[PDB]
Enzyme design. Structure first.
Site, PDB file in Angstrom:
ATOM      1  N   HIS A  75       0.837  -1.204   0.000  1.00 20.65           N
ATOM      2  CA  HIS A  75       0.000   0.000   0.000  1.00 20.65           C
ATOM      3  C   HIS A  75       0.875   1.258   0.000  1.00 20.65           C
ATOM      4  CE1 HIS A  75      -3.706  -2.430   1.049  1.00 20.65           C
ATOM      5  NE2 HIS A  75      -4.025  -1.704  -0.007  1.00 20.65           N
ATOM      6  N   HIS A 115      -6.802   7.124  -3.628  1.00 21.08           N
ATOM      7  CA  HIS A 115      -7.733   6.232  -2.941  1.00 21.08           C
ATOM      8  C   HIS A 115      -7.110   5.502  -1.741  1.00 21.08           C
ATOM      9  CE1 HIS A 115      -5.687   3.079  -5.228  1.00 21.08           C
ATOM     10  NE2 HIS A 115      -6.308   2.199  -4.468  1.00 21.08           N
TER      11      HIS A 115
HETATM   12 MG   LIG Z   1      -8.184   1.054   0.343  1.00 22.36          MG
HETATM   13 ZN   LIG Z   2      -6.053   0.195  -3.249  1.00 25.52          ZN
END
Ligand SMILES: [Mg+2]
Ligand SMILES: [Zn+2]
Ligand SMILES: Nc1nc(Cl)nc2c1ncn2Cc1cccc(OCC(F)F)c1
Length: 338
Positions: A75, A115
């Site tokens: 991430h 996002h």
């Molecule tokens: Mg997410």
């Molecule tokens: Zn994502």
């Protein structure tokens, strides 16, 4: 404009589905979002729509990418740039081009960029069990999804240098801000089957009914009118962001495997912390000491990917993604050898 040669060469074939996102990651030194954002926003004409300068867009990409945590295996800003690549690929497809309006394209590309901003590499369920600041701040409800959209708007509008929305008109910004929030919030896991079933029921099945009538000019206008409503355009936007977000199983095998290792390493880190701190173990299968990565990828693809991309492919026509999906599924099955 004046990009160095290796990063320029890394961004050559970005309309194509096969794209070396990890070479762009290495060439940019963990700054793929700013370089791929500039090229994508320029090609779609985003600052022409928003009336921002190239210098206002540069600062915006900078402060957004900065708040992506490099220490996260998955991430990080490379994931966001990948989701931006899959988003641009879907917008460019004929079915989305003739269905969505330019303001939707702007909402999708910004939404992919922001996002996961400031993701801590832990799941919502971890933050709630731990009582983290954002779980108390967002009342255990869509904890990280609310944070991503909110912080992104705090960073953008909080500074005049970064505000890509500052030269917009009153009504356009309210519509575009609601579009971004909705796409960012739609990525929350708990709403997965809800958003897929709404897409199947309101789009695929009505559209399949009308396609049985024929290829009539009056029939295509009924199809066009049905799909282009604000409700259905929202459902398409939710499907598009949701598919781009987890498009990695439909990538070339070399990338599919890398994405699997990154997300697996990230979930093993959370599992080590949960056992150490005494927290309830929310992902028991994802322990570095017991986890079969190929078999977990198969479970993942069976649960979230297969039906979702089946519906999306039936709407948009995505043969390369489904061919990669099949090849990658077979690769995971083939590694058992026991
Ligand atoms: Mg997410
Ligand atoms: Zn994502
Ligand atoms: N290859 C992947 N494997 C696994 Cl185990 N999780 C992944 C993967 N790519 C994204 N994620 C994150 C993720 C995890 C669970 C559900 C999920 O759902 C998508 C939507 F429903 F939120 C996404």
């Amino acid at each position: 404009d004046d990009v160095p040669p290796r990063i320029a060469r890394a961004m050559e074939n970005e309309e194509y589905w096969d794209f070396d996102i990890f070479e762009l990651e290495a060439a940019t030194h963990n700054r793929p979002l700013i370089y791929l954002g500039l090229k994508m926003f320029a090609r779609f004409g985003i600052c022409e729509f928003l009336h921002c300068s190239e210098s206002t867009l540069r600062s915006w990409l900078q402060i957004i990418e900065a708040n992506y945590h490099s220490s996260n295996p998955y991430h990080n800003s490379t994931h966001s740039a990948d989701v931006l690549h899959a988003t641009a690929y879907f917008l460019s497809k004929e079915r989305i081009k003739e269905t969505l309006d330019p303001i939707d394209e702007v909402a999708a590309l910004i939404a992919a960029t922001i996002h996961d901003v400031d993701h801590p590499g832990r799941t919502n369920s971890f933050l709630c069990n731990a009582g983290s600041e954002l779980a108390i701040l967002y009342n255990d409800t869509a904890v990280l999804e609310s944070h991503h959209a909110a912080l992104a708007f705090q960073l953008t509008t909080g500074d005049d240098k970064c505000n890509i929305f500052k030269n917009m008109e009153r009504n356009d910004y309210r519509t575009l801000r609601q579009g971004i929030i909705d796409m960012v919030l739609a990525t929350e896991m708990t709403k997965h089957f809800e958003h897929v079933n709404k897409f199947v029921n309101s789009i695929n099945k009505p559209l399949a009914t009308l396609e049985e009538n024929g290829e009539t000019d009056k029939n295509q206008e009924v199809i066009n009118t049905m799909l282009r409503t604000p409700e259905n355009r929202t459902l398409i936007k939710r499907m598009l962001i949701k598919c781009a977000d987890v498009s990695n199983p439909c990538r070339p095998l070399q990338y599919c495997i890398e994405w699997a290792a990154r997300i697996s390493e990230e979930y093993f880190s959370q599992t080590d912390e949960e056992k150490q701190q005494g927290l309830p173990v929310v992902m028991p299968v994802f322990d570095r000491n017991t986890c079969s990565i190929p078999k977990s990828q198969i479970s993942f693809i069976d649960y979230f990917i297969t039906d979702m991309f089946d519906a999306w492919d039936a709407f948009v026509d995505l043969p390369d993604l489904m061919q990669h999906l099949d090849n990658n599924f077979k690769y995971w099955k083939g590694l058992d050898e026991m």
